Amino acid sequence: SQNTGDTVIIWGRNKDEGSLREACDAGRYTTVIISFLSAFGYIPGTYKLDISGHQVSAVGPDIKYCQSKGKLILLAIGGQGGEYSLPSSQAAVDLHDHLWYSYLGGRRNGVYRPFGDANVNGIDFFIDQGAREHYNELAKMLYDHNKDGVMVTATTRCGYPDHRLDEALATGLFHRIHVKMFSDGRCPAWSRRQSFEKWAKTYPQSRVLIGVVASPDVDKDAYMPPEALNNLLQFINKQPNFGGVMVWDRFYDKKTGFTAHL
């Protein structure tokens, strides 16, 4: 197909999409983004993982299985709700420590790890809501584990710049950027190519992926059928840092077969 890069699937938004291991056994994806750690910052010590009623006890064994099959697993922070922001630098430190000891490679007895002894491979900054401040500091704190892996990625709205992420991206620490064509802030169809290329050329050291929906039931205006996405990909895959396609989401990708038809 014209997707020369990774295929990244969002998982966690509907329990009826099946387990994480099922997504990894589908033969379709290189990376799964578990979505979302959806509450933090507004209340000290309050953090919520919203994976739509998926059983957390199944996730850890499935992460280890997925990684044994060569898949990368990221946890997305943020999401589309209104229960998260970083109101201070201390909020960023607190969220760092929560992520490191609850989900990443850190260990501290007494900390609840929803996925047990499994480690996610990194954190996606899906900062679609709330205020912009202090994510640059969180990115530095997460990245610093690589200096003494933690992949640091972001998922942005369609138009460049995304003011919720621009300061964090300016740190230069983001390995991947997933540019949503869909959701609030969606580009008008005529501008998708130029918008994506602006993102790609602005961040030449990152792999830059195009985010699409698997069904017009998710976003009717932003949906591109496989044939139309391949027409767009034949242009944007010429960017040297084109990174692949991110698809919202596993439930709808199963429903339509989108990635299997690309």
Side-chain angles (χ1 to χ4, degrees):
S1 99
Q2 295 300 315
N3 177 19
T4 52
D6 282 299
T7 301
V8 181
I9 193 66
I10 296 287
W11 178 95
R13 307 292 67 236
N14 186 330
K15 181 194 173 65
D16 294 339
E17 70 202 333
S19 69
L20 176 63
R21 167 164 180 178
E22 178 191 298
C24 290
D25 278 338
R28 297 274 75 82
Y29 315 121
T30 59
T31 301
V32 181
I33 298 178
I34 298 174
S35 311
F36 292 106
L37 185 84
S38 55
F40 55 80
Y42 284 128
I43 305 169
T46 292
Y47 296 92
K48 300 182 196 174
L49 179 70
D50 172 9
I51 55 172
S52 308
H54 279 285
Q55 289 306 307
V56 152
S57 58
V59 176
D62 285 3
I63 288 170
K64 293 194 157 194
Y65 174 84
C66 287
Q67 290 167 335
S68 82
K69 304 298 186 189
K71 310 304 181 185
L72 285 177
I73 304 298
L74 303 173
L75 174 68
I77 58 170
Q80 295 188 93
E83 303 195 6
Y84 71 90
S85 200
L86 292 176
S88 70
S89 290
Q90 189 60 53
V93 172
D94 286 353
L95 176 56
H96 167 270
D97 290 353
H98 185 72
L99 292 171
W100 174 246
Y101 293 116
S102 308
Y103 295 97
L104 298 161
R107 293 295 190 277
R108 207 261 285 147
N109 279 356
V111 170
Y112 175 50
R113 292 185 59 91
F115 314 148
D117 197 43
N119 295 336
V120 301
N121 298 105
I123 301 299
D124 185 62
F125 284 55
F126 200 118
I127 311 306
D128 185 56
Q129 301 295 338
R132 67 201 283 273
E133 287 87 3
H134 310 297
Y135 289 104
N136 58 326
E137 297 158 48
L138 181 61
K140 180 56 171 187
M141 293 184 278
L142 289 166
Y143 191 94
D144 276 348
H145 298 281
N146 297 312
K147 305 172 171 178
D148 277 48
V150 180
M151 291 196 39
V152 179
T153 71
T155 296
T156 69
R157 295 183 180 211
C158 197
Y160 170 82
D162 182 337
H163 292 302
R164 287 191 173 89
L165 287 156
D166 188 74
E167 188 188 36
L169 293 171
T171 64
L173 301 179
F174 281 76
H175 298 101
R176 302 184 178 175
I177 304 171
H178 313 104
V179 178
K180 297 183 305 203
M181 300 293 105
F182 62 95
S183 195
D184 299 319
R186 66 186 66 73
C187 303
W190 66 263
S191 72
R192 291 176 183 143
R193 176 183 168 199
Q194 37 266 82
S195 293
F196 181 86
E197 296 170 343
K198 175 63 175 175
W199 280 101
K201 290 156 174 185
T202 301
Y203 300 105
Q205 304 308 337
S206 295
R207 293 277 169 184
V208 181
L209 289 83
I210 185 169
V212 302
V213 291
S215 169
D217 290 359
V218 181
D219 185 329
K220 170 147 42 39
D221 292 340
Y223 175 71
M224 291 174 277
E227 61 279 14
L229 178 57
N230 270 315
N231 185 45
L232 176 58
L233 285 174
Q234 80 180 317
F235 296 87
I236 64 170
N237 73 16
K238 302 312 181 282
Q239 297 300 136
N241 60 337
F242 173 76
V245 178
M246 183 189 65
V247 174
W248 180 293
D249 64 348
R250 174 63 178 149
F251 183 80
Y252 282 97
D253 192 44
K254 289 187 66 173
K255 177 179 193 285
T256 67
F258 186 86
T259 58
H261 290 74
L262 252 195

